[PDB]
Design a protein around this ligand. Structure first.
Ligand SMILES: CN[C@]1(c2ccccc2Cl)CCCCC1=O
Ligand SMILES: *[C@@H]1O[C@H](CO)[C@@H](O)[C@H](O)[C@H]1NC(C)=O
Ligand SMILES: *[C@@H]1O[C@H](CO)[C@@H](O)[C@H](O)[C@H]1NC(C)=O
Ligand SMILES: *[C@@H]1O[C@H](CO)[C@@H](O)[C@H](O)[C@H]1NC(C)=O
Ligand SMILES: N[C@@H](CCC(=O)O)C(=O)O
Lengths: 280, 50, 34, 269, 95, 49
């Protein structure tokens, strides 16, 4: 890659996003970092579930089917107790639908008591339905976002969910040179991609489920493509640098300049015109 | 601190010492280990305004 | 069903029931006054 | 569903019922200054739903009393809905068998379907059950399995009922299972709590130093870090139904029965 | 007066049924009114659920955004003077 | 009470770091830098933070 090209003498400088590692720094001389960007996880933002039509779906349609049968049975019992059955049926149907027609004229006082009791039962059923709706409502956004490497879903992987980074990158070095995630590294080694853009396209096309990459790149990708979002707290926070060979005369002058541009506000203007220029 | 480092009184200055383009032109020192900068602080206890 | 909920407004409703006679007397006196 | 766990059917319900009756009596008395049953029906409706046409009360001062009663009913229904929502927030998943003391282990064939006891030989669990429950050992011999992974596979496939084995490895398996479908019995129970230790030759000169080193490790917090980095699991760290109103519909049917019985007794008179 | 009665019953069924008139006459009219009332009750329940769920939303203020802002940019006039805090001898003062 | 809070999530006007000051041309720089990179790569800096 770039490090090999620079070491071989084919190049004299690496002006590109090159994360400052230890293995890289052992052979080449990094300048002062012109940016600070840790690693984050790019994931696809699932569309919110705006049903607005789950009426008989939430609990069980059999309850809605049995409600009418129970109402008819209660009406029949009221008719037999009265010994205008159609008028009483309409009145009950209006009461269970808050119509308030007022066409019900029970004969006996027991019929009146049963009618009042029925209304109370209906009120209770309505309350139960409202509670169920609240449970479904409050239970919105069931899916959560994995919180970086510390999340248990990443420490223990699975074939169903795959999270793979980019081959021949500092990231791979970070996973390899830290023996606390050997399972994660083994899982990621079977899904690495040729280039970052290919991984972005695969993630957006549901080919992957998570991407591990620099914050400076993933944040811009999320800003550009609203279909994707970035999650996970910044980890391995080490910025890019102008990699170049140790035995070079520019080492004492590039870095200072990068400092000056970092303090004169030039890098802030570059970020505004190239990274921070849009949102979603 | 920087003055003591320049005049060979001390060979190392570990502490809260921000990297600058003026200090680097005098003392050459290692890569940053804490990301810092310039920030503004203000109190918001006057009103929640939720 | 919290006890306070059944109390915090039902002591009030009992007060209203026992207070109805107060305004009963007030209005039946007002009617006769003019 | 907890159709009976509500504070209903208590003194509060009887207190509010008699308060409603007293309020209805006071309203009838105010109106009089055939309206008793009508006022009672209207007040019951106002408690339940305002679709109950009652002509019993026609008074000025009475209107304020009816408004106060309606305010109380509205507050009560709002509190009831809030209580149902709060109860629907939580759920109960206590346990299944509640330890080895359950009669299922004592009677493995007499109740319903056979309850298999999964176990692995060569271990201390087999020796413990042989030295404590010789009767259960003979029954469990027919289900002596091979390994922990095989036991988990069999449990996930329904071929076994319960698996009895060492607590630490079982807890690890529960914390590293897909879907958290299988859990240890109860909230985590130990039939014979014991340590692991580190075996040494009889009279070895290392025991007096190995024990001190292990005590130093457990007292310095290293054991907690190792447990967090080696035994933590995702499952462990996690924390209008037809059958829901079937009971209240049984109560409604009983209400219909009492209604018709009252019709009979009222029509004798 | 049937048009006004129908409009009032529709509005009430939307809000509350305490507005009765002799608008629905016939089985078809009663069935239509019942269906409308059921739909309005469902909408009401959905609105109440949404209002209850909305209580879990909160936000915080942030004043100006960075040193590039109207407040920080001009010290003179504008409003009551905005004090600037900066301990000297540091890198911030030099920058 | 966490009454006072920096503006927004925190935007650094001129982002830099701290480092460890050394004499100009000190032999320790080329090795202190490597040690610090090893520390940040092994997750120790996260634990200290
Ligand atoms: C008053 N009517 C409502 C109600 C609120 C609370 C309890 C029962 C009921 Cl019935 C108002 C809120 C939407 C649902 C509804 O019908
Ligand atoms: C480095 O910069 C200094 C001052 O900016 C200058 O005197 C010197 O010639 C420069 N050296 C190279 C190799 O650019
Ligand atoms: C150990 O268990 C195996 C089956 O898992 C069994 O065949 C063998 O006999 C056991 N060992 C002894 C000494 O009985
Ligand atoms: C340094 O601090 C002292 C006392 O705080 C002050 O008198 C002096 O002016 C400061 N110098 C600079 C360059 O900030
Ligand atoms: N860290 C600064 C001192 C504090 C400041 O100026 O903000 C130097 O070095």
């Amino acid at each position: 890659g770039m490090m090999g090209e620079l070491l071989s003498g084919q190049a004299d400088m690496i002006v590109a996003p090159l994360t400052i590692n230890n293995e890289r720094a052992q052979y080449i001389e990094f300048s002062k970092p012109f940016k600070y960007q840790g690693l984050t996880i790019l994931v696809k933002k699932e569309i919110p579930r705006s049903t607005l039509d789950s009426f008989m779906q939430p609990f069980q349609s059999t309850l809605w089917l049995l409600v009418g049968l129970s109402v008819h049975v209660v009406a029949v019992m009221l008719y037999l107790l009265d010994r205008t059955l159609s008028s009483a049926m309409w009145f009950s149907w209006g009461v269970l639908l808050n119509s308030g027609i007022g066409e019900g004229a029970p004969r006996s006082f027991s019929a009146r008591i049963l009618g009042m009791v029925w209304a109370g039962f209906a009120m209770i059923i309505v309350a139960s339905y409202t509670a169920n709706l609240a449970a479904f409502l409050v239970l919105d956004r069931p899916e959560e976002r994995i919180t970086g490497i510390n999340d248990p879903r990443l420490r223990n992987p699975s074939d169903k969910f795959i999270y793979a980074t980019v081959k021949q990158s500092s990231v791979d070095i970070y996973f390899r040179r830290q023996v606390e995630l050997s399972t994660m590294y083994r899982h990621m080694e079977k899904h690495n991609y040729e280039s970052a853009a290919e991984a972005i396209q695969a993630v957006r096309d549901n080919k992957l489920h998570a991407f591990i990459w620099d914050s400076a790149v993933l944040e811009f990708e999320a800003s550009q493509k609203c279909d994707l979002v970035t999650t996970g707290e910044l980890f391995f926070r080490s910025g890019f640098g102008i990699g170049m060979r140790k035995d070079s005369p520019w080492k004492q002058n590039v870095s200072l300049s990068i400092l000056k541009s970092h303090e004169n506000g030039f890098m802030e203007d570059l970020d505004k015109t190239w990274v921070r220029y849009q949102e979603c | 601190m920087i003055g003591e480092v320049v005049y060979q009184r001390a060979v190392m200055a570990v502490g809260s010492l921000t990297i600058n383009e003026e200090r680097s032109e005098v003392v050459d020192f290692s890569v940053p280990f804490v990301e810092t900068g310039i920030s503004v602080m203000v109190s918001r206890s006057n009103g929640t305004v939720s | 069903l919290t006890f306070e909920n059944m109390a915090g407004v039902f002591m009030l409703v009992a007060g209203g029931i026992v207070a109805g006679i107060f305004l009963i007397f007030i209005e039946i006196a007002y009617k006769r006054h003019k | 569903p907890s159709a009976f766990l509500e504070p209903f059917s208590a003194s509060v319900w009887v207190m509010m019922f008699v308060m409603l009756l007293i309020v209805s009596a006071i309203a009838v008395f105010v109106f009089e200054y055939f309206t008793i049953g009508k006022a009672i029906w209207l007040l019951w409706g106002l408690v339940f739903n305002n679709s109950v046409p009652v002509q019993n009360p026609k008074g000025t001062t009475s209107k304020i009393m009816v408004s106060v009663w309606a305010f109380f009913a509205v507050i009560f229904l709002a509190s009831y809905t809030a209580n149902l929502a709060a109860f629907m927030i939580q759920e109960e998943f206590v346990d299944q068998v509640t330890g080895l003391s359950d009669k299922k282990f004592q009677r493995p064939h007499d109740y319903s379907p056979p309850f298999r006891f999964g176990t692995v030989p060569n271990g201390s669990t087999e020796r413990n059950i042989r030295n404590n429950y010789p009767y259960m050992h003979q029954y469990m011999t027919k289900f002596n399995q091979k390994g922990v992974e095989d036991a988990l596979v069999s449990l996930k496939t329904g071929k076994l009922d319960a698996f009895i084995y060492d607590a630490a490895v079982l807890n690890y398996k529960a914390g590293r299972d897909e879907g958290c479908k299988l859990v240890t019995i109860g909230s985590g129970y130990i039939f014979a709590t014991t340590g692991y230790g580190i075996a040494l030759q009889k009279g070895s000169p290392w025991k007096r130093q190995i024990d001190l080193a292990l005590l130093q490790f457990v007292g310095d917090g290293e054991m907690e870090e190792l447990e967090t980095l080696w035994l933590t699991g995702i499952c462990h760290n996690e924390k209008l139904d037809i059958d829901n109103m079937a009971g209240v519909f049984y109560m409604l049917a009983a209400a219909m029965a009492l209604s018709l019985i009252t019709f009979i007794w009222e029509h004798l008179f």
